[PDB]
Design a protein around this nucleic acid. Structure first.
Lengths: 159, 185, 51, 222, 58, 171
RNA sequence: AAAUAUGUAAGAAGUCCUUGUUACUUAAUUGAACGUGGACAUUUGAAUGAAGAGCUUUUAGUGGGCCAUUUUUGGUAAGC
RNA sequence: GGAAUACUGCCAGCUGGGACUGAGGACUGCGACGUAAGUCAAGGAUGCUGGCAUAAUGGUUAUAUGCCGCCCGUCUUGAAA
RNA sequence: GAAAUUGUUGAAAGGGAAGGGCAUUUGAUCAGAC
């Protein structure tokens, strides 16, 4: 018959790594996790206590409560036509700080800095971000770069 | 053909022209649809919309909330206008003098404010005193106090008041409601 | 009540563009450009005529 | 209160000055449109005469016409077609060329024909088929005051000024283009030029990027 | 007589009519599932600040 | 369609590490501007580590040949796909211009080997500057001295549907 | 180790500065959470669009499906 | 070395022929030409003329011709069956 | 004193069904308007 357990179809998903098996480095435990920190959930096969479900591998969440050795995470889960709020308890081995939020914070610092310097002269610093614009004109010169003409090649078997 | 991004011929979903066949309410609406059209004041927009509303969207404001309303900072002189019904609260033994504008007062409320030095007025008299709703405040009664709302949404693990005719012991207070008898909820 | 079109009905055109009168009277649609006598470099012509 | 010549003489004076102001900016755009159109022409001579190649600026604006009907379109192209407001066959919209807009254009390539439009094509479109979105209502422009009361915030006062913000993609192009209702074009007058439409323009069909041949196609539609 | 066993066909299209949007985000979320030891502390700390501010703003 | 010869020059996009790229050039026979640029990207990707997104086109210039009146004899090499394999070929077309020779080649391949535009590579088109350097008979035939021939059995096209005398094919 | 798919973020519920509470925590007014006071407003923090947005109650029919390109399993195959 | 022509594109360049439509119903608005008066092709047709004033047009109905049109209701993935 | 169904008279059409739709010719009949 059919077989739907907790770790069904997780063969390669919780497979450890290439050449990284064994005890985990202690930067994973030295970390400090606050309420409201944005985290991603990558499991660790060695640590069996406090593993998440397969459904949350690679899913990013936010910390709501913190415990002695583990951490609670808020996850929104698509079921039906909606998002149902899901709460997970995870040891800090299967949780790592989401770096996605981080580059926005460094953007705020420059964004706050540029406005502060701009108001001294009022130049409309244009703090927004722009997408990649179409290129503008240029002059390409042929000193020592004279064009060389290429032609289609005939057929050969090479075997 | 067209690829519609939204449903076609969708009515607004809001109520205009209240469905009651009371002639007097229609006159009140007519006075305030003219007023909201030609005064450019947000107060007459509210009252005209409120005159549309249904009975459960007009919960009965009691004289106690009015008293609490007048005990707000700098509101004891504002005219109180209730688009709905005003009932009596025998749970308070004092009362201010402020006048009230409403559709219907109860006899106990009509006796109450009149005894306390006030004077209960209708909505048209409000218009000829406050065409732009000057020095007024809208009081809305508690909508979620009706016994039907307690039953809305019931399912497992939310405690939402089962529909029941006869209550007490041995009426759905059994397996499903305790861990001693099966699961609980 | 009725959409009249520019690009015709000259009266409607002048309504939307005060510059149409002087654009036409000056014949800016058939204006002439001053001649220039510059010629391409020798490297350009050989490349264009290259095999 | 005679009120038949006092304010009427006031409104006529306020009309004449607006016609007056509209006049220089039309004249102003003319030397601006002439000068640039002659710079690239002349900068090409200088490159060839100096043994170099003048690589012109990449086009900043494309006109997009929906080519396919409304049936049988997968979810992703249908959503992108809606975000450009092309919800029926032979509809037109100006799109600002940018990385975030190029990837939209690739997803919709089997369903649209687009290219780089010239002044003549854009000027004719707004004059004949230009409608403004006026309080969620499709209103023929037909007057400068209609644009004035709706795009006067950004310095746009006329139908000719509106065309200026389109062709030279200005700081207020987003609002200006959004104000312009999507263009309802007819079928081309001389035909589509090909026996089968739904092949790429490079493959003898109709859809895809036809870099300047959109002008011929839109003019037959317009 | 045999029948169809299971398909997900038309299930995603039903899900986009009244679609799958993120529900909401409220400020001051619930405290369900929080360490009780920190929660008892929170009440006592909360009362102290409220009473202290009440005396200052009497 | 009716073909035009363009030269297309493109290069990889400049960068700080390697500015001033090599500016490769290639001659393309195509109906219009857009196809000429496309075929350049098609063929260039077959030689170099480049594509349309990772490079730029610098110039395009249509090449119309010097003598649209002098009659030439062109040797043409191609590379085309059959239903079973890829084959090289060499032929002559004798005509007045280079583009009309290619326009003949595509029809000629489509008629003899059912080779459509997609499955044909034009390797190079060159003039045979010397007579008696022609190796195929069908073009060597017309190079004789004082060539002359009739056109027997001429068929007149009639405008009206009915003719009142039996037509004659003298010529 | 792709492609196509898939989670999160792109602000005012933000950022920065000072210090009040506590029965938790620390050798330690050390921290943790919540607040008090002050500063930063329309390029306020990518694109495009928005046809209004968010919410509730109740109730119908349906709960035999089938076909096409692409992916794919059993079968020699099949309008299986 | 000097021109022309082709091709492509532009003109708020001029002009001839045909077809369909005439919604709206005092003025207001925007314009154009004029020193002014005023005029206009400017927020939707008017002027002149002819025949008939009757079954002539038109309606109905029967037939003829051209083209098209499978039997309804029901179960059903699927009905002219 | 209905319909199915039938007789008589009158009109019309009919080369292996009939009935229907758009459009008009033809025949019969007819309202309005003046």
């Amino acid at each position: 018959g059919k077989s739907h357990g907790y770790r069904s179809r997780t063969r390669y998903m919780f497979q450890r790594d290439f050449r990284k098996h064994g005890a985990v480095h202690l930067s994973t435990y030295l970390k400090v996790y606050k309420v409201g920190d944005i985290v991603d959930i990558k499991a660790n096969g060695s640590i069996q206590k406090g593993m998440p479900h397969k459904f949350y591998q690679g899913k990013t969440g936010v910390v709501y409560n913190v415990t002695k050795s583990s951490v609670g995470v808020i996850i929104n889960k698509m079921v039906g036509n909606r998002y149902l709020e899901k709460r997970l308890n995870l040891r800090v081995e299967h949780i790592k700080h989401s770096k996605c939020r981080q580059e926005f914070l460094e953007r705020v610092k420059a964004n706050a800095a540029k406005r502060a310097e701009a108001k001294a002269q009022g130049v409309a610093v244009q703090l927004k971000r722009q997408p990649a614009q179409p290129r503008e004109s240029r002059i390409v010169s042929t000193e020592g770069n004279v064009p060389q003409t290429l032609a289609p090649v005939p057929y050969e078997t090479f075997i | 053909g067209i690829d519609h991004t939204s449903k076609q011929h969708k009515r607004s979903g809001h109520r205009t022209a209240p469905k009651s066949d009371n002639v007097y309410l229609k006159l009140l609406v007519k006075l305030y649809t003219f007023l909201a059209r030609r005064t450019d004041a947000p107060f007459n927009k509210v009252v005209l919309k409120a005159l549309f509303l249904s009975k459960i969207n007009r919960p009965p404001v009691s004289v106690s909330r009015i008293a609490r309303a007048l005990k707000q900072e700098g509101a004891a002189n504002k005219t109180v206008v209730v688009v709905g019904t005003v009932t009596d609260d025998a749970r308070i033994f004092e009362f201010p003098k402020t006048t009230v504008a409403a559709l219907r007062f109860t006899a106990g409320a009509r006796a109450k404010i009149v005894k306390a030095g006030g004077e209960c007025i209708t909505l048209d008299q409000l218009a000829v005193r406050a065409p732009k709703g000057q020095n007024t405040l809208i009081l809305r009664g508690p909508r979620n106090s009706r016994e039907a709302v307690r039953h809305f949404g019931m399912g497992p693990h939310k405690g939402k008041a089962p529909r029941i005719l006869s209550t007490g012991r041995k009426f759905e207070r059994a397996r499903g409601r305790r861990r001693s008898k099966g699961f609980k909820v | 009540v009725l959409k009249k079109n520019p690009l015709k009905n000259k009266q409607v055109l002048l309504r939307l563009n005060p510059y149409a009168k002087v654009f036409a009277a000056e014949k800016l649609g058939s204006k002439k450009a001053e001649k220039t006598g510059t010629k391409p470099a020798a490297v350009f012509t050989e490349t264009l005529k290259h095999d | 209160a005679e009120q038949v010549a006092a304010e009427r003489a006031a409104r006529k004076a306020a009309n004449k000055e607006k016609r007056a102001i509209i006049l220089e900016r039309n004249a102003a755009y003319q030397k601006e449109y002439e000068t640039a159109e002659r710079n690239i022409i002349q900068a090409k001579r200088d490159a060839k005469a100096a043994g170099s190649y003048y690589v012109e600026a990449q086009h900043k604006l494309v006109f997009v016409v929906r080519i396919k009907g409304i049936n049988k379109i997968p979810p992703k192209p249908r959503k992108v077609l809606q975000l450009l407001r092309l919800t029926r066959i032979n509809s037109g919209t100006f799109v600002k060329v940018t990385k975030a807009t190029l990837e939209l254009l690739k997803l919709i390539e089997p369903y649209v024909a687009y290219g780089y439009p010239s002044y003549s094509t854009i000027r004719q479109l707004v004059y004949k088929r230009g409608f403004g979105k006026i309080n969620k209502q499709r209103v023929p422009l037909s007057d400068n005051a209609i644009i004035e009361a709706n795009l006067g915030k950004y310095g746009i006062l006329s139908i000719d000024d509106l065309i200026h913000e389109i062709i030279t993609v200005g700081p207020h192009f987003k609002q200006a283009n959004n104000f312009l209702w999507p263009f309802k074009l007819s079928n081309p007058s001389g035909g589509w030029g090909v026996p089968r439409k739904f092949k790429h323009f490079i493959q003898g069909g109709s859809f895809g990027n036809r870099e300047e041949f959109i002008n011929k196609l839109v003019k037959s539609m317009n | 007589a045999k029948s169809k066993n299971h398909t997900a066909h038309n299930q995603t299209r039903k899900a986009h009519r009244n679609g799958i949007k993120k529900p909401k985000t409220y400020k001051y979320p619930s405290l369900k599932g929080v360490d009780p030891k920190f929660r008892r502390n929170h009440k006592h700390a909360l009362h102290g600040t409220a009473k202290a501010l009440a005396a200052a703003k009497k | 369609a009716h073909f035009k010869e363009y030269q297309v020059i493109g290069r990889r996009l400049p960068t700080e590490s390697v500015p001033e790229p090599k500016l490769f050039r290639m001659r393309i026979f195509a109906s219009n501007e857009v196809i000429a640029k496309s075929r350049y990207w098609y063929f260039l990707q077959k030689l170099h580590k480049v594509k349309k997104a990772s490079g730029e086109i610098v110039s395009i210039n249509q090449i119309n040949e010097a003598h649209p009146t002098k009659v030439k004899n062109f040797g043409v090499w191609v590379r085309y796909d059959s239903r079973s394999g890829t084959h090289n070929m060499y032929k002559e077309i004798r005509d007045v211009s280079r583009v009309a020779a290619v326009e003949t080649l595509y029809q000629d391949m489509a008629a003899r080997h059912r080779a459509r535009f997609r499955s044909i590579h034009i390797l190079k088109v060159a003039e045979i500057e010397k007579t008696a350097d022609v190796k195929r008979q069908y073009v060597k035939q017309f190079l004789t001295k004082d060539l002359k021939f009739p056109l027997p059995h001429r068929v007149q096209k009639s405008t009206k549907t009915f003719s009142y005398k039996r037509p004659s094919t003298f010529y």
